[PDB]
PDB file of C-alpha atoms in Angstrom:
ATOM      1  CA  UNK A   1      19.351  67.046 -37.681  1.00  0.00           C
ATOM      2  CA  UNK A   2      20.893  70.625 -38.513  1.00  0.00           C
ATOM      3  CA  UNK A   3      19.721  69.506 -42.078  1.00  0.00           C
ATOM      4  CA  UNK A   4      20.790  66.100 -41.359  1.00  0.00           C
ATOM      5  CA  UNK A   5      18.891  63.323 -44.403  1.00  0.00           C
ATOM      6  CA  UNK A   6      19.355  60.069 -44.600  1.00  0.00           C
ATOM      7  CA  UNK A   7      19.326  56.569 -46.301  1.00  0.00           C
ATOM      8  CA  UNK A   8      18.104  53.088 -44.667  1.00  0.00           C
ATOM      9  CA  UNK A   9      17.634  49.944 -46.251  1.00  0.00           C
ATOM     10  CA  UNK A  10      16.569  46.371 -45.119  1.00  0.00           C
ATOM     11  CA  UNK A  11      18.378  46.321 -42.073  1.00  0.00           C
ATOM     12  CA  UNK A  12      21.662  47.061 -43.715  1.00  0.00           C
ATOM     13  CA  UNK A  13      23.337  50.665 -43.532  1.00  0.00           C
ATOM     14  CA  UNK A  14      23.340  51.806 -46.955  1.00  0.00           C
ATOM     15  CA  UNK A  15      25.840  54.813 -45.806  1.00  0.00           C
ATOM     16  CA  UNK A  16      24.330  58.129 -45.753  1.00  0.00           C
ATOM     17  CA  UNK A  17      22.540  60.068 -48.956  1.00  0.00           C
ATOM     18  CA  UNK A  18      21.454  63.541 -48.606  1.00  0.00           C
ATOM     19  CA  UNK A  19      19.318  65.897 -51.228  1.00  0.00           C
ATOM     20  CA  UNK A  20      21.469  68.557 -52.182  1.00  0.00           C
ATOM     21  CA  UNK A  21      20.735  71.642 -54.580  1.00  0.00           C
ATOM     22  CA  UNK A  22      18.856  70.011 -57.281  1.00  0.00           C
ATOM     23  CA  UNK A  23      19.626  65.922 -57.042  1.00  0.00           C
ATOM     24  CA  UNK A  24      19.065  63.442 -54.137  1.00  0.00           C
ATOM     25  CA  UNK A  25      22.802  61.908 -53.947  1.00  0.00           C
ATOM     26  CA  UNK A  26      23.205  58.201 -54.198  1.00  0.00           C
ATOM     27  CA  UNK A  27      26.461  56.371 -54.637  1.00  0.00           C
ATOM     28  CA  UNK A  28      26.953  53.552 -56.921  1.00  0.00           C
ATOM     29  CA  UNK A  29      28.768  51.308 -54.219  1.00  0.00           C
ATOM     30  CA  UNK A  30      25.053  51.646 -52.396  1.00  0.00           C
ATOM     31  CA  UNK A  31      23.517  48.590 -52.763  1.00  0.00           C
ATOM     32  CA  UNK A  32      19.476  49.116 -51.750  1.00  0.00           C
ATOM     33  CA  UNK A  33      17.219  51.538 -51.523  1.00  0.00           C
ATOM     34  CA  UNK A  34      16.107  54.614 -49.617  1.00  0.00           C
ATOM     35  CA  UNK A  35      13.593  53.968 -46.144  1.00  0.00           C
ATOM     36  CA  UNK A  36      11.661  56.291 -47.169  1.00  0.00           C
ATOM     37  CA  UNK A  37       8.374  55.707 -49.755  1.00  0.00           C
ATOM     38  CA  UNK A  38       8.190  58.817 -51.968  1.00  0.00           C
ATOM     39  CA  UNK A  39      12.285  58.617 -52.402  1.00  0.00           C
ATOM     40  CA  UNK A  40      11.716  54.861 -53.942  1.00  0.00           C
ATOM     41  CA  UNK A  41      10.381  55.393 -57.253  1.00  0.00           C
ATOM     42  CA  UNK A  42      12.856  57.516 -59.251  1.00  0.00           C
ATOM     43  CA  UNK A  43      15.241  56.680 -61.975  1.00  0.00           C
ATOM     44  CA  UNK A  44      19.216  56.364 -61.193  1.00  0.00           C
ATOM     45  CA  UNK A  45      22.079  56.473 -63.852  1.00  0.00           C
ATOM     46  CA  UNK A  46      25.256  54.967 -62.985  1.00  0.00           C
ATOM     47  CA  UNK A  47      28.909  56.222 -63.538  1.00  0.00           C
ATOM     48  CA  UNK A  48      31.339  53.623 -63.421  1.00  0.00           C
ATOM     49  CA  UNK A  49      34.371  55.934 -63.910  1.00  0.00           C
ATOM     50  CA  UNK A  50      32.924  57.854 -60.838  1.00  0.00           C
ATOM     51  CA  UNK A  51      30.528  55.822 -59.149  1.00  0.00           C
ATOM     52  CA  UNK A  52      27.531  57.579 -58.984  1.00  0.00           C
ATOM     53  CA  UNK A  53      23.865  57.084 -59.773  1.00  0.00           C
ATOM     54  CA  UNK A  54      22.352  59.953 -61.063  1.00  0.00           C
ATOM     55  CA  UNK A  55      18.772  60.835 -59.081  1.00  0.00           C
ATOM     56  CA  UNK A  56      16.858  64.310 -59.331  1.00  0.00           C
ATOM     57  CA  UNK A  57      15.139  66.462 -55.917  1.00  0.00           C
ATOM     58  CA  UNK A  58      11.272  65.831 -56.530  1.00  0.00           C
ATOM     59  CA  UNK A  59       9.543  68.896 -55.978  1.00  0.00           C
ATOM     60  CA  UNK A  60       7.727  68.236 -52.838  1.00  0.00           C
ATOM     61  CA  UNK A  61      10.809  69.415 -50.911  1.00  0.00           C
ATOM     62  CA  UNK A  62      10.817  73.069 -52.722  1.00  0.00           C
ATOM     63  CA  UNK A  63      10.721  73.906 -48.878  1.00  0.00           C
ATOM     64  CA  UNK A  64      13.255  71.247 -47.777  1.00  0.00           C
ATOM     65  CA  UNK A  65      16.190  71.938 -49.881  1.00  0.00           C
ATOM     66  CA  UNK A  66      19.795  72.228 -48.841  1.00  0.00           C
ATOM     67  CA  UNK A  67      22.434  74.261 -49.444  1.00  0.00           C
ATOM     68  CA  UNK A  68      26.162  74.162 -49.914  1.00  0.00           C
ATOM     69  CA  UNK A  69      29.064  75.424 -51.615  1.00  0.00           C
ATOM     70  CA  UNK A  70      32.132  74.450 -53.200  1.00  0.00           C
ATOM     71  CA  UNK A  71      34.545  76.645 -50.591  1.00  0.00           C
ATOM     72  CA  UNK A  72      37.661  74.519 -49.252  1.00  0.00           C
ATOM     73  CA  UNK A  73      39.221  76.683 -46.658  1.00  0.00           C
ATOM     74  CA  UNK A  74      41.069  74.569 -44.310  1.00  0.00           C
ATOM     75  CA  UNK A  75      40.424  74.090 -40.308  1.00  0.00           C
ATOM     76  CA  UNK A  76      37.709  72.260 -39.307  1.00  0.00           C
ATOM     77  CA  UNK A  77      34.150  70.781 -40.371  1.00  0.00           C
ATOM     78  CA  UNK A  78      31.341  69.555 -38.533  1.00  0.00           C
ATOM     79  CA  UNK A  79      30.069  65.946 -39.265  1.00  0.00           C
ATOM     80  CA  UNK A  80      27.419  63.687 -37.471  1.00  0.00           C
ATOM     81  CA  UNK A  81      30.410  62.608 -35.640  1.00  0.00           C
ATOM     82  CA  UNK A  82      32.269  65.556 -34.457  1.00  0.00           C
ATOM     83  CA  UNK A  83      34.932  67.394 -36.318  1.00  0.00           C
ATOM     84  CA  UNK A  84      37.123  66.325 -39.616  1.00  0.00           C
ATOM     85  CA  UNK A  85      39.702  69.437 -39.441  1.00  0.00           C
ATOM     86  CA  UNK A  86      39.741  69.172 -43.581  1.00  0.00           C
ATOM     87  CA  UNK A  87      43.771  70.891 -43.371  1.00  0.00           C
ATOM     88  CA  UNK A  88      46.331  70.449 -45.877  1.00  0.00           C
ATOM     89  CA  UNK A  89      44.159  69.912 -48.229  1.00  0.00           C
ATOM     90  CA  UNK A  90      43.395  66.588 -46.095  1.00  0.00           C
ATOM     91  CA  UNK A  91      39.618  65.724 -44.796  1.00  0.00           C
ATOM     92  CA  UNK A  92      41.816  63.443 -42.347  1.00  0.00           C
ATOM     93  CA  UNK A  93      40.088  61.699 -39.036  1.00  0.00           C
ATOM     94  CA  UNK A  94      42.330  60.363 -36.231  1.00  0.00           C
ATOM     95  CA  UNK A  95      42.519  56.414 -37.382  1.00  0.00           C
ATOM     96  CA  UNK A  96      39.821  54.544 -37.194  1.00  0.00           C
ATOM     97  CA  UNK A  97      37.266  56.589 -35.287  1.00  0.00           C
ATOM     98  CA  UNK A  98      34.621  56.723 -37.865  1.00  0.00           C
ATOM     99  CA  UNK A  99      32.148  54.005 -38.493  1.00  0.00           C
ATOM    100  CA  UNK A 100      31.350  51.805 -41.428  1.00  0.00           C
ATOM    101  CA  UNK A 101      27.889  52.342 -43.064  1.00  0.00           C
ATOM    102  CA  UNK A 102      28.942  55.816 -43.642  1.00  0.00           C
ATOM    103  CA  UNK A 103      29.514  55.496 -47.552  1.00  0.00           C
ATOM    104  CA  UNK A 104      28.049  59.015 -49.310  1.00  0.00           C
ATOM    105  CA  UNK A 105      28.275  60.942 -45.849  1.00  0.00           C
ATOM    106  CA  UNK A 106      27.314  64.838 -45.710  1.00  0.00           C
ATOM    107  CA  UNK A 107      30.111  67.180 -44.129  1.00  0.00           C
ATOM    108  CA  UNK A 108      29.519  70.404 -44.393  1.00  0.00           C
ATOM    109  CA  UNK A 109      31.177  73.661 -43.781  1.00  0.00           C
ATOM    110  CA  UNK A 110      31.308  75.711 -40.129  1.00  0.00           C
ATOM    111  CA  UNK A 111      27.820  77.038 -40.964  1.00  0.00           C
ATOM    112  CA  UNK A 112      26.012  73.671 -42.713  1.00  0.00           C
ATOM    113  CA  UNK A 113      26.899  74.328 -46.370  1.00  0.00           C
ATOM    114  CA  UNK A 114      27.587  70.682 -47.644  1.00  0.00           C
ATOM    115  CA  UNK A 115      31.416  70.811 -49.096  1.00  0.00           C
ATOM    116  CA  UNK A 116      32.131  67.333 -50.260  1.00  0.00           C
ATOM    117  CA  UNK A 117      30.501  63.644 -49.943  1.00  0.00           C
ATOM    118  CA  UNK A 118      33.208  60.680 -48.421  1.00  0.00           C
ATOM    119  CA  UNK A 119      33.181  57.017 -49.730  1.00  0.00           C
ATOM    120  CA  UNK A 120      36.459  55.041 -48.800  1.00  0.00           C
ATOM    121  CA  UNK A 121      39.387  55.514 -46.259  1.00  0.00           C
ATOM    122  CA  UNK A 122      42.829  53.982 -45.160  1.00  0.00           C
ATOM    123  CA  UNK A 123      45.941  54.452 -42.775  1.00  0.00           C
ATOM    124  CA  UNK A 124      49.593  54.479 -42.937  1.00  0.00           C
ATOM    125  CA  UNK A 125      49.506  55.927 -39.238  1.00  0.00           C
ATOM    126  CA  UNK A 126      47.724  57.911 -36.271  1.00  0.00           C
ATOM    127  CA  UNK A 127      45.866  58.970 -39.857  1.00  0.00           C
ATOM    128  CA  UNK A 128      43.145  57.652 -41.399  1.00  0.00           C
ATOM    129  CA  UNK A 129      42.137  59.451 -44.919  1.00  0.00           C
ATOM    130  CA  UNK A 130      39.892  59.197 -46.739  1.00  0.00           C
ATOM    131  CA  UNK A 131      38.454  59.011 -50.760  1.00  0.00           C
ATOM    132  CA  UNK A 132      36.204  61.511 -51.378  1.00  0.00           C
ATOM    133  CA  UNK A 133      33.808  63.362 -54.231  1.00  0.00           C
ATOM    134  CA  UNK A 134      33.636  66.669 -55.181  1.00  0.00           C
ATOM    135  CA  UNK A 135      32.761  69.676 -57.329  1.00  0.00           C
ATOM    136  CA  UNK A 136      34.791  72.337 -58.199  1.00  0.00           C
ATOM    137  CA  UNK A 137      32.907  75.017 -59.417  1.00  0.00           C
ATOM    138  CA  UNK A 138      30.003  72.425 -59.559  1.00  0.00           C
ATOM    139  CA  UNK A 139      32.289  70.335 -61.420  1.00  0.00           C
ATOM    140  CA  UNK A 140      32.485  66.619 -59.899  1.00  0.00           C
ATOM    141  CA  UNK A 141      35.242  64.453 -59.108  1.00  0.00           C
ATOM    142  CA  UNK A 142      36.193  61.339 -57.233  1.00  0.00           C
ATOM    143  CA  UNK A 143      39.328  61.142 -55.414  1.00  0.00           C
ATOM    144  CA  UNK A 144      40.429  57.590 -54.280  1.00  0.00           C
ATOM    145  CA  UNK A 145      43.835  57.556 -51.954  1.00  0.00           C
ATOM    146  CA  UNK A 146      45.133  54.543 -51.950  1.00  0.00           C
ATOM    147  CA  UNK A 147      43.601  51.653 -49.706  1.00  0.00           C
ATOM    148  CA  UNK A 148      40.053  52.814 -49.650  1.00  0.00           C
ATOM    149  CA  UNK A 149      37.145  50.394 -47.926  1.00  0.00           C
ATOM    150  CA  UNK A 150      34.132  50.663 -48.078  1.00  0.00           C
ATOM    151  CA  UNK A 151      31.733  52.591 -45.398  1.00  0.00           C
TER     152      UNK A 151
ATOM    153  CA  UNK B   1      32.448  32.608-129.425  1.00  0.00           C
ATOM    154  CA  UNK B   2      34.293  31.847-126.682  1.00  0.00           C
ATOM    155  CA  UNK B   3      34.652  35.560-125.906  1.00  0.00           C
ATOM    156  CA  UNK B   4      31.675  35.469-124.135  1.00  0.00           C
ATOM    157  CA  UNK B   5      33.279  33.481-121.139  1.00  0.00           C
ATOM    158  CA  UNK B   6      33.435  36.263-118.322  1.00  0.00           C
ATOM    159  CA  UNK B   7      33.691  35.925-114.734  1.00  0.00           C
ATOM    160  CA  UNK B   8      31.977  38.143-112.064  1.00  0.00           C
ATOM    161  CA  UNK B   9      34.747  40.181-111.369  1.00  0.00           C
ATOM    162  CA  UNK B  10      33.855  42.479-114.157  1.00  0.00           C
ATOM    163  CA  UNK B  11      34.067  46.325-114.993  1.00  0.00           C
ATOM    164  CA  UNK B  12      31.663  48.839-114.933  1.00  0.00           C
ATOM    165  CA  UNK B  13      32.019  52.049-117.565  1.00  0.00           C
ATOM    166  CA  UNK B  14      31.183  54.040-114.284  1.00  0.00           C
ATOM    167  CA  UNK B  15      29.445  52.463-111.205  1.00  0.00           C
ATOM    168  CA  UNK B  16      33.708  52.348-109.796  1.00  0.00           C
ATOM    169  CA  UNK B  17      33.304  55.953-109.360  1.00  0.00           C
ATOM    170  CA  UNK B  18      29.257  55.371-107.469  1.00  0.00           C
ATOM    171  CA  UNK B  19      30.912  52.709-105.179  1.00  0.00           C
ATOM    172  CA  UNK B  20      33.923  55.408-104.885  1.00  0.00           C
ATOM    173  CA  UNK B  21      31.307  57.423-103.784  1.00  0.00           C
ATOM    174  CA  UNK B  22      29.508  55.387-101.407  1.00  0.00           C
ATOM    175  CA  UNK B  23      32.404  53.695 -99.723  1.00  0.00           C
ATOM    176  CA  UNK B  24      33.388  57.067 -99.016  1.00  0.00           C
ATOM    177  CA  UNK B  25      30.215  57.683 -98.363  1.00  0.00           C
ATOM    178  CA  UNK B  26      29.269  57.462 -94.948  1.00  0.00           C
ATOM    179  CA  UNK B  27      32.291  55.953 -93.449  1.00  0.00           C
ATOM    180  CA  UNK B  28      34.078  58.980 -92.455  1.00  0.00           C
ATOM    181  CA  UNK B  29      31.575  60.336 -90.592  1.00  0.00           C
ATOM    182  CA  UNK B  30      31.468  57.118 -88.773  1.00  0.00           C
ATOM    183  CA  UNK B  31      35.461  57.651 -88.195  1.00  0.00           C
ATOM    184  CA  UNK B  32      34.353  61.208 -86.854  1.00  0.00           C
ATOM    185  CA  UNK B  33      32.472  59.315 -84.609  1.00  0.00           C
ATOM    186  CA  UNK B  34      34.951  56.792 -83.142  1.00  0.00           C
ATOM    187  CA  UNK B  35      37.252  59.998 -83.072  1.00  0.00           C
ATOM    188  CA  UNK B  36      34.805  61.537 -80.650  1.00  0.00           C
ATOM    189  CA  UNK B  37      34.743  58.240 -78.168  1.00  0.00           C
ATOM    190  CA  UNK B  38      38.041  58.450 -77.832  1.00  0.00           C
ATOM    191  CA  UNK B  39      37.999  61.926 -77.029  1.00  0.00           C
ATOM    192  CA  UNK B  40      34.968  61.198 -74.318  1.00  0.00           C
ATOM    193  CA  UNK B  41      37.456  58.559 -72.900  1.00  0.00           C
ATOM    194  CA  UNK B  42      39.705  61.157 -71.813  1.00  0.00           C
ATOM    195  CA  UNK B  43      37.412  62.986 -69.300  1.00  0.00           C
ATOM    196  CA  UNK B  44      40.665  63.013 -66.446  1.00  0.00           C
ATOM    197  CA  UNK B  45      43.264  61.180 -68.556  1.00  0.00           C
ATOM    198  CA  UNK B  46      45.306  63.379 -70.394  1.00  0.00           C
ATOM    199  CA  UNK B  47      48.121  65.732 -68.452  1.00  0.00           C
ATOM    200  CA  UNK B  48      48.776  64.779 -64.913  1.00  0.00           C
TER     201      UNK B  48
ATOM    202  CA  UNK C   1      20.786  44.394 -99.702  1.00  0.00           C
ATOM    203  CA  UNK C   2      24.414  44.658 -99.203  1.00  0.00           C
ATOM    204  CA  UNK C   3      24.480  48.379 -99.517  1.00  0.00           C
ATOM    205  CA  UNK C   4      21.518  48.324 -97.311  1.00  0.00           C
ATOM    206  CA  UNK C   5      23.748  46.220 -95.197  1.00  0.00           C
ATOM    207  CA  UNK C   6      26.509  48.464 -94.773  1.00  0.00           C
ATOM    208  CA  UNK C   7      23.923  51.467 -94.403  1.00  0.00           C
ATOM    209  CA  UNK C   8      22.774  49.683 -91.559  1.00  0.00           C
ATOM    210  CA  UNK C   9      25.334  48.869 -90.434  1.00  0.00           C
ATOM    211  CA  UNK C  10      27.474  52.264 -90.570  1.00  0.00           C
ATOM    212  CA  UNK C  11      24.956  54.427 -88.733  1.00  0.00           C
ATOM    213  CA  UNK C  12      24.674  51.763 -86.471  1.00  0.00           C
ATOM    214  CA  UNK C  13      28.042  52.822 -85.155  1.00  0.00           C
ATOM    215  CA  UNK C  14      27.453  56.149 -85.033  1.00  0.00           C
ATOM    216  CA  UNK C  15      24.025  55.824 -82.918  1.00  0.00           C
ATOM    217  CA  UNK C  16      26.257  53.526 -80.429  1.00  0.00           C
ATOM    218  CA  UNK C  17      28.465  56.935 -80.830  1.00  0.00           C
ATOM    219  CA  UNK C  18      25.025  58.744 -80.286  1.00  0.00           C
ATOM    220  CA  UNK C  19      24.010  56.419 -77.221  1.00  0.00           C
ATOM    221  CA  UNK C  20      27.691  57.296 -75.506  1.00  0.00           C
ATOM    222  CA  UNK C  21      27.190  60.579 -76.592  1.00  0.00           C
ATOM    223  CA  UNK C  22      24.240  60.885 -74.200  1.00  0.00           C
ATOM    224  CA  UNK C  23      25.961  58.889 -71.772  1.00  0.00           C
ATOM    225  CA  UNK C  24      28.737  61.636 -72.301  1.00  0.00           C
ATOM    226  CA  UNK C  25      26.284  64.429 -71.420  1.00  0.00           C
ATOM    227  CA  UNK C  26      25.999  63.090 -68.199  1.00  0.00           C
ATOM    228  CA  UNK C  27      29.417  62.593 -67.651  1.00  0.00           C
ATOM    229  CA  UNK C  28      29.867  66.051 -66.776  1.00  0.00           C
ATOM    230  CA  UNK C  29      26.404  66.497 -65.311  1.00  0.00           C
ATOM    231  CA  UNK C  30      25.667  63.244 -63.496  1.00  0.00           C
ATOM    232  CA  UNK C  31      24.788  64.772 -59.426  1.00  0.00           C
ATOM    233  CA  UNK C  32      26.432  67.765 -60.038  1.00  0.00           C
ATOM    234  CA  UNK C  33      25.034  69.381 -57.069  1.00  0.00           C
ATOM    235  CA  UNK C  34      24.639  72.645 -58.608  1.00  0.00           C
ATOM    236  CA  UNK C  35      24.442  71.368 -62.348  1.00  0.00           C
ATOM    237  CA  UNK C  36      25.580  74.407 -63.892  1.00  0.00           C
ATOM    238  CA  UNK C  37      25.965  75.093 -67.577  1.00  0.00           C
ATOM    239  CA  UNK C  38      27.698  77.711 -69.406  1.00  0.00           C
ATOM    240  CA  UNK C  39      28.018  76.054 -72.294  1.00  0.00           C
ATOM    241  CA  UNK C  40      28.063  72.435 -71.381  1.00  0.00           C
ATOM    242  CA  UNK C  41      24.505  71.567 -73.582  1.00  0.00           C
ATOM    243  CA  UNK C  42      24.687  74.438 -75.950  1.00  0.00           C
ATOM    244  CA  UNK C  43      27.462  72.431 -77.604  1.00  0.00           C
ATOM    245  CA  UNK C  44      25.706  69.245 -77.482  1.00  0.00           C
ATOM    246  CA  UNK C  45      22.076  71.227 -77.811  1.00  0.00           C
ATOM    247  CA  UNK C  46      20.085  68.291 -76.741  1.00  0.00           C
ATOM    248  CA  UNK C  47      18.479  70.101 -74.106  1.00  0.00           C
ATOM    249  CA  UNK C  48      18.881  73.513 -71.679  1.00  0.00           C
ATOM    250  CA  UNK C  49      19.188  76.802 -73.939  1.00  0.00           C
ATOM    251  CA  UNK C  50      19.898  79.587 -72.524  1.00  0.00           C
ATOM    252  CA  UNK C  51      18.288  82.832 -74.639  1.00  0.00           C
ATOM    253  CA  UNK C  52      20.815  83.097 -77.727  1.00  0.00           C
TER     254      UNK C  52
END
């Protein structure tokens, strides 16, 4: 845990959700809810042209916030599981080495600023990609390369 | 008289130019509106 | 009751405009980390006004 939040559900691995700046992320793919008690009561709304579910920071974590940016350099950046060396404009991972139940992960920068949130991934290679939201300038956007399944 | 045999279809001296004015009435802002979903539809579809 | 009708019926069009108009304030705004507005809602003016 460098700021390191998560989701839990049931006994199935409802990927990763983080709060971030001013909304607790949660993907629309999620099925479930968070482990947690004073997570579970909020409202969602759900973008089907970006898959998303809209859910706000409650207050209580005014001292537990994260930050993050919306910097792409390229080289590398940490995850729970080592390095993705985002270069070329490409968050790649050498094929296959991540783990499903990873669907709205956190990576972050080389200092734990959180830089974009991953959902889907394929291979034509030695290469696994992967499909990925962002905001530029706090502007969001999913990207979906081609073959994407589900973490 | 047999003059008297009208239909329904009839004429008014003015109430043509009140349903002129109501069909294009609140219609067009309705057209505005449909204009504007199709503009929302576009949110990345336009340039590539 | 006809021109009721179509009354009710017209606006009825534009509120379903209305209803994906809020569901196109969102659209920009939805977990936008940051959720910044320049002049995203003072076009809309729903809510979140800055002074002017």
């Amino acid at each position: 845990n460098d700021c390191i939040f998560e989701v839990k559900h049931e006994g199935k691995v409802t990927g990763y959700a983080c709060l971030v700046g001013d909304k607790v992320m949660k993907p629309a793919h999620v099925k479930g809810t968070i482990d947690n008690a004073d997570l579970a009561k909020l409202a969602f709304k759900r973008s089907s042209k970006y898959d998303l579910e809209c859910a706000q920071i409650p207050v209580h974590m005014k001292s537990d916030a994260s930050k993050f940016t919306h910097e792409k350099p390229e080289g590398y950046y940490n995850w729970h599981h080592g390095a993705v060396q985002y270069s070329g404009g490409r968050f790649t991972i050498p094929t296959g080495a991540g783990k499903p139940g990873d669907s709205g992960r956190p990576i972050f920068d080389n200092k734990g600023r959180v830089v974009a949130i991953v959902l889907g991934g394929a291979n034509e290679g030695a290469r696994t990609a992967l499909s990925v939201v962002t905001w530029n300038k706090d502007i969001v956007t999913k990207i979906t390369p081609e073959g994407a399944e589900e973490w | 008289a047999s003059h008297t045999t009208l239909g329904v279809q009839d004429i008014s001296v003015t109430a043509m130019s009140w349903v002129q004015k109501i069909t294009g009435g609140v219609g067009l802002v309705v057209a505005v509106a449909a204009l504007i979903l199709i503009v929302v539809l576009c949110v990345s579809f336009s340039r590539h | 009751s006809v021109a009721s009708f179509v009354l009710l019926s017209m606006v009825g069009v534009a509120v379903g405009m209305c209803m994906c108009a809020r569901r196109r304030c969102i659209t920009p705004y939805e977990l936008t980390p940051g959720a910044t507005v320049p002049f995203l809602l003072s076009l809309i003016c729903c809510i979140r006004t800055a002074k002017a």
